[PDB]
Write a protein that binds this ligand. Structure first.
Ligand SMILES: CCCCCCCCCCCCCCCCCC(=O)OCC(COC(=O)CCCCCCCCCCCCCCCCC)OC(=O)CCCCCCCCCCCCCCCCC
Ligand code: HEA
Ligand code: HEA
Ligand SMILES: CCCCC/C=C\C/C=C\C/C=C\C/C=C\CCCC(=O)O[C@H](COC(=O)CCCCCCCCCCCCCCCCC)COP(=O)(O)OCCN
Ligand SMILES: CCCCC/C=C\C/C=C\C/C=C\C/C=C\CCCC(=O)O[C@H](COC(=O)CCCCCCCCCCCCCCCCC)COP(=O)(O)OCCN
Ligand SMILES: CCCCC/C=C\C/C=C\C/C=C\C/C=C\CCCC(=O)O[C@H](COC(=O)CCCCCCCCCCCCCCCCC)COP(=O)(O)OCCN
Ligand SMILES: CCCCCC/C=C\CCCCCCCCCC(=O)O[C@H](COC(=O)CCCCCCCCCCCCCCC)COP(=O)(O)OC[C@@H](O)CO
Ligand SMILES: CCCCCC/C=C\CCCCCCCCCC(=O)O[C@H](COC(=O)CCCCCCCCCCCCCCC)COP(=O)(O)OC[C@@H](O)CO
Ligand SMILES: CCCCCC/C=C\CCCCCCCCCC(=O)O[C@H](COC(=O)CCCCCCCCCCCCCCC)COP(=O)(O)OC[C@@H](O)CO
Ligand SMILES: CCCCCCCCCCO[C@@H]1OC(CO)[C@@H](O[C@H]2OC(CO)[C@@H](O)[C@H](O)[C@@H]2O)[C@@H](O)[C@H]1O
Ligand SMILES: C[C@H](CCC(=O)O)[C@H]1CC[C@@H]2[C@H]3[C@H](O)C[C@@H]4C[C@@H](O)CC[C@]4(C)[C@@H]3C[C@@H](O)[C@@]21C
Ligand SMILES: C[C@H](CCC(=O)O)[C@H]1CC[C@H]2[C@@H]3[C@H](O)C[C@@H]4C[C@H](O)CC[C@]4(C)[C@H]3C[C@H](O)[C@]12C
Ligand SMILES: C[C@H](CCC(=O)O)[C@H]1CC[C@H]2[C@@H]3[C@H](O)C[C@@H]4C[C@H](O)CC[C@]4(C)[C@H]3C[C@H](O)[C@]12C
Ligand code: CUA
Ligand SMILES: [Cu+2]
Ligand SMILES: [Mg+2]
Ligand code: NA
Ligand SMILES: [Zn+2]
Ligand SMILES: [Zn+2]
Ligand SMILES: [Zn+2]
Lengths: 58, 43, 98, 259, 46, 79, 84, 227, 514
């Protein structure tokens, strides 16, 4: 291996006004959307489940 | 502390309304539930 | 038994860490890491308060060990005095980043 | 422009996903324990893994790449870790309390003795002793790793860090084996209850510590660490020692004196 | 960054006192009414 | 004989609010004594003390329960 | 204590590697040797349905709800005794 | 039992409860003083235009308000501890009676000689006989001999409950797997009430305790008749 | 932009704002719960007809008021907004983790509301003691949901504690020593050390309960050799520090409110106020068993706990008098905040003293588990924390918003609340002496008078909360912007205007070492 920090430092300090979590590129944007979708969706799911368990199924 | 006069003065009439409404927002719902208590207990 | 391969701060430090590291080498303190030593605080020898604007908040600890700190805005212009002990402070504006 | 050495972090979505991931995980355990469905638990464990990854990714970005870790920001992180580790010790203390409480006053139901009537403890001179020499040895090799890093020796830092990770895994495997070969279970009363839950959480910690060590391994491979600034490794080594110590306590308390 | 000053450092709008009232009435009104309904809920299951 | 028992006396070995071990100790003692007598050819009336005591102290359900378990061969205690 | 060795003139990387290979690892060798020696399957004891063991207040959330998570048939009896 | 508009403790039935009554009078006096002193002092600081806003020295007055309270504490501790160790004194009882908490009733067991035992339930409000106390009456009372040193052993066969009788100054938690001892001794005959003192479920509020204290002779006939 | 600021924040002021919002909302829920509790006791007989429901209500009321109202408002709201400003710090040490501490609460709260929705809810008491809390007496999700809510609220606070301690130790002006920091900051740091040490034990505790209920462990199950008492030790080992954790921050705000409206530049005997809080914190860790006097403990043990518990009054006294000493010779400003702070001083003392009555194992035997205990903590905790919270709130509202309250309405709010809480809780002292137990949905007929009154008092307080809402609407509706604030030389937090800019202390303060 060789040292490639400098490249990563240049990339990440590049003045594009992007928040660090999206500063790496398009991949960052995907990962994010995946994570947020799962969270929001899963949460929407739990609400549903809570609604189900709220009532007796005799 | 010192402050400038109300940029949007709330007149007395406007406070009776604001108050009245604050109160009803607490009282009506609980009031409804509580009023229909007998109807819930056995149903 | 020995060898190399590990970057040094000198070689790899970047951003603000690097800035602070280099300034510290020149004996400077642009990012207020050190506590400023006070002068005699007289009218002739006031406390020089660096600043990058035309006002900075000053906290005066009138006497050693006091638990209460006196806070006030020091403006650019004629030196001012702590409302408590009256020691003097004068704002010396601008620069830092060339 | 700011004239202090502290770090103002950019608006981040991680805290919200980590929060929701927590909701999904707890809600998920509830779904599992009571309505037999691992769906939620599945989703939650995932978004949690995602949050942890991205969150600490950004921290590496903020530090190694953007240079936001001034000696002052690093000082604070030192505090935070020590404080964290401390809360972890208080957690374990609740379990050591529970063990001691039960083992010192064995009720009639156990036959009023310890170990309880019908429990045949593991010989501490066997695998438990090996496990101990394994964690103790990993403590030495990680110190050699730290000193290699500080002395600028990349090869030996990686070598020693490797050995450390290998020992961590070895321990986890041995423990896994012990868990299976054990004549007692978690349902076997308070003895089983305290044995498995204490060694259980400790074991999970060993896995977390191992993971943390591995991350340091890769970051080192990618040269992120300078001979003088390597907090991620520092924290992982503190956490590793914490873990090693919790083991010495478990070994003496539950495995030895408790037999 | 974001808007600064009186009525700007809050996640709700104070531009209209009446809309403000309705928002506040709902916010607090909802939290106060929750127990009353959870109870009614628990009484209507059995 | 040497009896005329009203209730279980204070026992200096169990001076606290927690009498659980007291009951249990006399329950064991009685049955240990009972097994010793019946075995070597002797009389169970000697074990009368422990019997009176544990009977006075132990709740019915515990005794009932411990008995069922001695029968079942699942008594945790050593007798 | 002071151990029985010596160094201390300067505790550095060469020394800790000296300890990793000259002491820590050999200890893991001996303890590995010892363990994979005293191992061997010990004759499982007679089952006895003691009420303080094999607890079941709620069925496990897995399998048939009656086997423990790391159930070993060879040594872990169920509430009704060992398995086939 | 308590009466309408009662302010303090139910009249002491045993000598210990008497002891606590006094101890509470002693303590409550102190509570009144301090709470009134402070209330007063506040009104004092707020009733004057005279001011003094410069730095005031503390290392002197702190001695006063550290030594005084410490003393007042010791003045409560003494009688509190004397009474505590007194309750613990070895007493050698004449009878041992056990009680078991159940959801939602109490069972009692007098097993010194005979194997006597029964369940004690709250008399429903609809099944109350004229003059009887709502929520307080039980079908089977705990008949006990007045003027005697009795040993109560408390426990439970399900959740937690707590066996309490205010008049006698009694309250022992009913814990399953455990046998809690407490001694009782009534200086007078009569009926003595109490309630479950640990949330045990839906009917925690409806599982009272009623003690019937009578002369030994009547207790024995009661015992035989109850077999 | 809305979402970036309010969901992805890393700003200490914004975050403290969410906390204040969350807490206010929680407070409404906790209040509805309380009004339910007293409605049931409002007259003899049953109102709800379902005592499991009543038990669930009483359990929720406690959890809500403690975990969702008090802690959030104090450490979360006032803690975040004020601490950074008071030490001239740019923001909290870990401004990101700080956002998660906040977001863990709505999920934690959701879990709680769920436990009451599913099954028959958890009517176990906020102490959640097994076996009543076990899978047999409380079978179903409810208790498990509750245990989880606590895990969330717990990680939120344990993290929040790591933040404040780090912030306060590491982010003060290079020249400022710990003994040059305001009292509110000391109060928060100490509260945080308590949280750091106590929550993990509670955590361990409720985890053991969870496994007893779902993994067939027998920690608190005698059948397995367990012991329900063990749970109480673990729960209370946290529970006591927790009660101190609930009042300490209020001590901080009171010191500041009193020094300020006394027209003073500093609190009487600062180092004495610091020693007080430290001691209280320390002692608050070695007195937990006074919650267990009736479980049947050794007499010696009970003697120790009676003694340890009383010593706490010494440092606590020093604080009381120093507040009176701060009022001494000041130019008294009869502001609404001052009134709350005065109410606090009296009421807190009362409750604290009854707490001294209860420290006596002997008297406790008769008082334990009765309404005397309910009157003690509603005086110290409920009146204490709430009063401090109300004081800190009206004091710093203009600072947080930039607007002013109508002082007259606020004084009326204080008046109504004062009458309301005493008429609600004073008569409970009587009910407790005469023996009416806690956690009862109904009481023997003799207790009718006092229970009727107390419930009427509960309503007055309601009127006070409704009014409080309206008052806040009026501040925001009228829009009187702040111009001038007094004594800023000794109240740093007021120095950057009202409200202060998003980022403050971009350029640190100047402080000479001399
Ligand atoms: C609301 C219902 C009131 C009912 C009153 C009694 C009716 C009696 C009939 C008829 C009266 C005569 C016949 C019965 C005598 C029974 C004697 C007994 O067995 O004796 C024991 C009893 C009865 O004790 C008494 O002997 C009553 C004492 C009442 C003190 C009241 C202070 C009230 C202040 C304002 C009004 C209340 C609300 C605000 C209270 C604010 C906090 C105190 O039980 C107590 O221990 C209750 C109190 C518990 C501890 C609270 C400690 C701090 C309290 C106040 C400090 C204020 C300082 C400044 C001075 C006060 C400044 C404001
Ligand atoms: C704000 C929260 C708070 C605070 C700060 C306190 C403060 C105190 N508490 Fe209280 N307490 C609670 C909240 C709080 N408590 C809660 C929530 C419960 C019930 C929990 C439950 O079971 O649900 C409880 C329960 C409780 C019990 C157990 C009751 C029982 O179940 O039987 C005990 C036992 O000793 C006790 C004692 C004390 C004492 C001695 C103090 C003291 O530290 C107070 C000291 C202060 C003063 C003494 C007043 C001011 C001082 C002076 C003017 C100096 C002069 C004084 C003297 C010389 C005496 N508290
Ligand atoms: C801090 C805690 C807290 C608070 C504030 C309160 C407030 C009140 N509580 Fe209580 N309560 C407890 C904690 C609290 N309580 C606890 C721990 C228990 C024990 C539960 C158990 O037994 O397990 C309990 C138990 C308890 C009981 C005994 C239950 C029983 O034994 O059966 C009763 C009954 O009267 C009661 C009543 C009330 C009432 C009427 C109020 C309130 O109405 C009093 C007046 C208070 C308010 C009206 C608060 C207003 C606050 C806001 C509106 C926030 C505003 C925010 C901003 C402005 C930013 N509470
Ligand atoms: C199923 C079980 C699973 C097993 C356990 C799991 C994990 C362990 C993981 C990894 C560790 C093993 C070996 C490491 C491999 C290579 C190291 C390469 C470098 C090297 O060869 O290092 C040398 C020493 O290593 C060396 O003997 C290597 C040292 C090996 C030491 C252990 C062997 C013990 C031998 C018997 C002695 C026992 C007697 C006891 C005496 C008393 C003790 C005080 C020194 O050389 P250099 O010229 O100064 O260095 C130039 C730069 N490298
Ligand atoms: C290999 C060593 C490492 C241990 C961990 C590895 C795998 C298990 C999965 C998760 C474990 C994480 C923490 C421990 C929680 C419970 C104890 C588990 C320890 C363990 O694994 O014990 C096993 C029981 O498994 C069981 O029930 C486990 C059932 C699995 C479900 C887990 C239950 C989840 C409950 C978690 C509670 C979370 C609360 C934590 C809060 C933190 C602070 C807020 C033992 O097996 P057994 O057959 O009974 O006996 C062996 C007989 N041959
Ligand atoms: C039977 C029970 C069973 C369970 C047992 C389980 C486990 C056993 C326990 C522990 C073993 C585990 C791990 C040990 C290994 C490493 C830990 C890390 C320590 C380290 O290496 O620390 C360093 C130095 O010491 C420093 O921090 C010193 C500064 C510390 C700051 C943080 C503390 C602040 C918190 C509150 C303060 C307390 C106040 C004291 C006075 C109170 C009086 C009552 C790092 O530097 P720093 O932060 O920049 O400070 C600058 C000061 N030099
Ligand atoms: C620590 C330094 C300060 C020193 C002060 C001393 C305080 C605590 C240490 C002492 C612990 C050992 C004492 C055991 C000796 C008694 C043995 C015993 O038997 O005690 C047992 C429980 O002890 C148990 O678990 C005890 C379990 C531990 C409880 C103590 C809680 C403190 C833990 C938190 C501290 C964090 C420290 C961080 C770690 C590095 C059971 O109770 P008994 O009432 O007997 O019931 C029997 C009845 O049938 C008859 O009446
Ligand atoms: C199957 C496995 C899944 C199990 C779940 C948990 C999984 C993994 C947890 C392992 C932890 C990984 C954490 C990685 C952190 C990487 C970021 C890092 O290490 O960040 C560093 C800062 O430290 C920092 O924030 C330090 C950050 C502290 C993190 C430690 C926290 C441990 C988390 C434990 C969570 C569970 C708690 C127990 C449950 C009961 C960056 O600074 P430096 O290194 O000096 O670099 C800068 C130089 O380059 C300049 O020259
Ligand atoms: C029933 C199941 C319940 C489950 C509950 C689970 C709760 C949450 C799950 C998801 C959380 C994982 C997400 C990763 C969080 C990492 C936080 C971190 O590592 O935070 C750091 C602070 O704490 C530090 O160092 C040192 C502190 C390290 C904290 C690691 C976080 C672990 C969270 C678990 C805590 C459990 C408590 C343990 C005791 C019981 C960094 O602070 P930031 O503000 O980010 O940045 C500062 C910048 O200067 C960095 O350049
Ligand atoms: C603890 C906090 C609660 C405090 C008490 C609440 C204060 C009173 C608020 C009024 O509440 C209501 O008033 C009613 C009666 O005055 C109800 O109307 C009802 O009653 C009627 C008239 O008798 C009908 O016309 C309608 O159908 C109706 O449902 C009703 O639903 C409810 O909104
Ligand atoms: C390639 C690298 C040399 C430095 C560089 O990256 O240029 C070498 C040097 C030492 C490291 C190795 C160490 O010698 C320790 C390990 C020994 C081997 O048995 C497996 C891989 C092993 C885990 C390491 C892999 C290897 O790729 C490393 C990382
Ligand atoms: C020494 C220390 C700090 C002094 C300083 O450096 O300013 C001061 C602060 C508070 C003081 C304490 C508090 O005033 C309370 C106590 C008052 C008594 O008069 C003496 C002991 C007493 C326990 C004090 C001891 C010591 O003088 C303390 C502890
Ligand atoms: C209550 C707790 C045990 C809890 C448990 O059963 O797990 C025990 C453990 C050690 C005990 C302490 C120590 O044994 C030493 C002290 C001895 C005295 O007789 C009473 C107080 C005394 C300070 C104890 C208080 C209490 O009984 C302690 C703290
Ligand atoms: Cu039994 Cu309450
Ligand atoms: Cu306490
Ligand atoms: Mg109780
Ligand atoms: Na009722
Ligand atoms: Zn000055
Ligand atoms: Zn910014
Ligand atoms: Zn290092």
């Amino acid at each position: 291996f060789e040292n490639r920090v400098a490249e990563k430092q240049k990339l990440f300090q590049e003045d594009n006004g992007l928040p660090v979590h999206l500063k790496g590129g398009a991949t960052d944007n995907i990962l994010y959307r995946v994570t947020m979708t799962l969270c929001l969706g899963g949460t929407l799911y739990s609400l549903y489940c809570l609604g189900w368990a709220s009532f007796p199924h005799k | 502390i010192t402050a400038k006069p109300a940029k949007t003065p709330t007149s007395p009439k406007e406070q009776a309304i604001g108050l009245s409404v604050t109160f009803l927002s607490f009282l009506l719902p609980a009031g409804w539930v509580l009023y229909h208590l007998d109807n819930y207990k056995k149903s | 038994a020995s060898g190399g391969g590990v970057p040094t701060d000198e070689e790899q430090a970047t951003g603000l860490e690097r800035e602070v590291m280099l300034a510290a080498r020149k004996g400077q303190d642009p990012y207020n890491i050190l506590a400023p030593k006070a002068t005699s605080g007289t009218k002739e020898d006031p406390n020089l308060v660096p600043s990058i604007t035309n006002k900075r908040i000053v906290g005066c600890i009138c006497e050693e060990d006091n638990s209460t700190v006196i806070w006030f805005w020091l403006h650019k212009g004629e030196a001012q005095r702590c409302p408590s002990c009256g020691t003097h402070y004068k704002l010396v504006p601008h620069q830092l980043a060339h | 422009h700011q004239t202090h050495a502290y770090h103002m972090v950019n608006p981040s979505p991680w805290p919200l996903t980590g929060a929701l991931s927590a909701l999904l995980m707890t809600s998920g355990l509830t779904m599992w324990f009571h309505f037999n469905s691992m769906t939620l638990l599945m989703i939650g464990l995932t978004t949690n893994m995602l949050t942890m990854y991205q969150w600490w990714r950004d921290v590496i970005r903020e530090s190694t790449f953007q240079g936001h870790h001034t000696p002052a920001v690093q000082k604070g992180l030192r505090y935070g870790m020590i404080l964290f580790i401390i809360s972890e010790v208080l957690f374990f203390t609740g379990f050591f309390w529970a063990f001691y409480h039960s083992s010192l006053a064995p009720t009639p139901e156990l036959g009023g003795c310890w170990p309880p009537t019908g429990i045949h403890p593991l010989n501490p001179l066997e695998v438990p002793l090996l496990n101990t020499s394994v964690l103790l040895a990993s403590g030495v090799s990680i110190t050699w790793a730290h000193h290699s890093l500080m002395e600028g020796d990349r090869k030996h830092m990686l070598q020693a860090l490797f050995i450390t990770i290998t020992l961590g895994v070895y321990f986890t495997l041995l423990q896994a084996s012990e868990y299976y070969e054990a004549p007692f279970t978690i349902s076997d009363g308070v003895y089983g209850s305290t044995f498995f839950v204490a060694t259980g959480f400790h074991g999970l910690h060993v896995i977390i510590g191992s993971t943390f060590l591995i991350v340091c391994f890769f970051r080192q491979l990618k040269f992120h660490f300078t001979s003088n600034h390597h907090f991620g490794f520092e924290a992982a080594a503190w956490y590793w020692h914490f873990v090693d110590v919790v083991w010495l306590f478990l070994y003496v308390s539950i495995y030895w004196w408790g037999s | 960054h974001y808007e600064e000053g009186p009525g700007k450092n809050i996640p709700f709008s104070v531009e209209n006192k009446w809309r403000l009232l309705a928002m506040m009435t709902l916010f607090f009104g909802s939290g106060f009414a929750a127990p009353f309904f959870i109870v009614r809920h628990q009484l209507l299951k059995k | 004989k040497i009896k005329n028992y009203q209730t279980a006396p204070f026992d200096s070995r169990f001076p606290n609010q927690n009498q659980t071990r007291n009951c249990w100790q006399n329950y064991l003692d009685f049955h240990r004594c009972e097994k010793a007598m019946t075995a070597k050819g002797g009389d169970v009336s000697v074990c009368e003390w422990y019997r009176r005591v544990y009977k006075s102290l132990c709740p019915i359900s515990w005794v009932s329960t411990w008995d069922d378990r001695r029968a079942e061969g699942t008594f945790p205690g050593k007798i | 204590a002071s151990a029985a060795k010596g160094d201390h003139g300067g505790t550095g990387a060469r020394t800790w590697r000296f300890l990793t290979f000259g002491l820590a690892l050999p200890s893991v060798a001996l303890c590995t040797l010892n363990s994979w020696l005293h191992s061997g399957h010990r004759e499982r004891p007679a089952f006895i349905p003691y009420h303080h063991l094999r607890i079941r207040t709620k069925p496990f959330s897995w399998g048939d709800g009656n086997h423990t998570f790391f159930h070993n048939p060879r040594v872990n009896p169920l509430p009704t005794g060992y398995e086939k | 039992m308590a009466y309408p508009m009662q302010l303090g403790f139910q009249d002491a039935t045993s000598p210990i409860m008497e002891e606590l009554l006094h101890f509470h009078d002693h303590t409550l006096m102190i509570v009144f003083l301090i709470s009134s002193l402070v209330l007063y002092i506040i009104s004092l600081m707020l009733t004057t235009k005279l001011t003094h806003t410069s730095t005031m020295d503390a290392q002197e007055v702190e001695t006063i308000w550290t030594i005084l309270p410490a003393i007042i504490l010791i003045l409560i501790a003494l009688p509190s501890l004397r009474i505590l160790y007194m309750m613990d004194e070895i007493n050698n009882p004449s009878l041992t009676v056990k009680t078991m908490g159940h959801q939602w009733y109490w069972s009692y067991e007098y097993t010194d000689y005979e194997d006597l035992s029964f369940d004690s339930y709250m008399i429903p409000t609809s099944e109350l006989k004229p003059g009887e106390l709502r929520l307080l009456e039980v079908d089977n009372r705990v008949v006990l001999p007045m003027e005697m040193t009795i040993r109560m052993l408390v426990s439970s066969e399900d959740v937690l409950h707590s066996w309490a009788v205010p008049s006698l100054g009694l309250k022992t938690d009913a814990i399953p797997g455990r046998l809690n001892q407490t001694t009782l001794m009534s200086s007078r005959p009569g009926l003595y009430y109490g309630q479950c003192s640990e949330i045990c479920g839906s009917n925690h509020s409806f599982m009272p305790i009623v003690l019937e204290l009578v002369p030994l002779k009547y207790f024995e006939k009661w015992s035989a008749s109850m077999l | 932009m809305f979402i970036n600021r309010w969901l992805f924040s890393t700003n200490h002021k914004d975050i403290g704002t969410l906390y204040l919002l969350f807490g206010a909302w929680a407070g409404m829920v906790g209040t509805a719960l309380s009004l339910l509790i007293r409605a049931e006791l409002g007259q003899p007989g049953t109102l709800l007809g379902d005592d499991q429901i009543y038990n669930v209500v009483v359990t929720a009321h406690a959890f809500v008021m403690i975990f969702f109202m008090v802690m959030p408002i104090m450490i979360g709201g006032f803690g975040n907004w004020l601490v950074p400003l008071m030490i001239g710090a740019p923001d909290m040490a870990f401004p990101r983790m700080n956002n998660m501490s906040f977001w863990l609460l709505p999920p934690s709260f959701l879990l709680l509301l769920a436990s009451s929705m599913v099954e028959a809810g958890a009517g176990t008491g906020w102490t959640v003691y097994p076996p009543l809390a076990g899978n047999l007496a409380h079978a179903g999700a409810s208790v498990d949901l509750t245990i989880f809510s606590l895990h969330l609220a717990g990680v939120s606070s344990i993290l929040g504690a790591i933040n404040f301690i780090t912030t306060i130790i590491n982010m003060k002006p290079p020249a400022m020593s710990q003994y040059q920091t305001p009292l509110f900051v000391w109060s928060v740091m100490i509260t945080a050390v308590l949280l750091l040490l106590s929550l993990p034990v509670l955590a361990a505790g409720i985890t053991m309960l969870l496994t007893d209920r779902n993994l067939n462990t027998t920690f608190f199950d005698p059948a397995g050799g367990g012991d329900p008492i063990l749970y109480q030790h673990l729960f209370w080992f946290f529970g006591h520090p927790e009660v101190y954790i609930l009042i300490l921050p209020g001590f901080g705000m009171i010191s500041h409110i009193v020094t300020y409206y006394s027209g003073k530049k500093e609190p009487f005997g600062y180092m004495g106020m610091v020693w007080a809080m430290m001691s209280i914190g320390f002692l608050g860790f070695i007195v937990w068993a006074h919650h267990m006097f009736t479980v049947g403990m050794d007499v010696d043990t009970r003697a120790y706990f009676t003694s340890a518990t009383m010593i706490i009054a010494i440092p606590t006294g020093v604080k009381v008098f120093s507040w009176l000493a701060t009022l001494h010779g000041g130019n008294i400003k009869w502001s609404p905040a001052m009134m709350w702070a005065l109410g606090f001083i009296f009421l807190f003392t009362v409750g604290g003293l009854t707490g001294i009555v209860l420290a006596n194992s002997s008297l406790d035997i008769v008082l334990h588990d009765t309404y005397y205990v309910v009157a003690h903590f509603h005086y110290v905790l409920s009146m204490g924390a709430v009063f401090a919270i109300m004081g800190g709130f009206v004091h710093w509202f203009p600072l947080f918003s930039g607007y002013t309250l109508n002082d007259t309405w606020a004084k009326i709010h204080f008046a109504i609340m004062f009458v309301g809480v005493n008429m609600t809780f004073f008569p409970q002292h009587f009910l407790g002496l005469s023996g009416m137990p806690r956690r009862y949905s109904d009481y023997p007929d003799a207790y009718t008078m006092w229970n009727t009154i107390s419930s009427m008092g509960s309503f007055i307080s309601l009127t006070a909360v409704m009014l409080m809402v309206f008052i806040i609407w009026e501040a925001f509706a009228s829009k009187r912007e702040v111009l001038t604030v007094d004594l800023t030389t000794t109240n740093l937090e007021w120095l950057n205007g009202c409200p202060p800019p998003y980022h403050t202390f971009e350029e640190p303060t100047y402080v000479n070492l001399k």
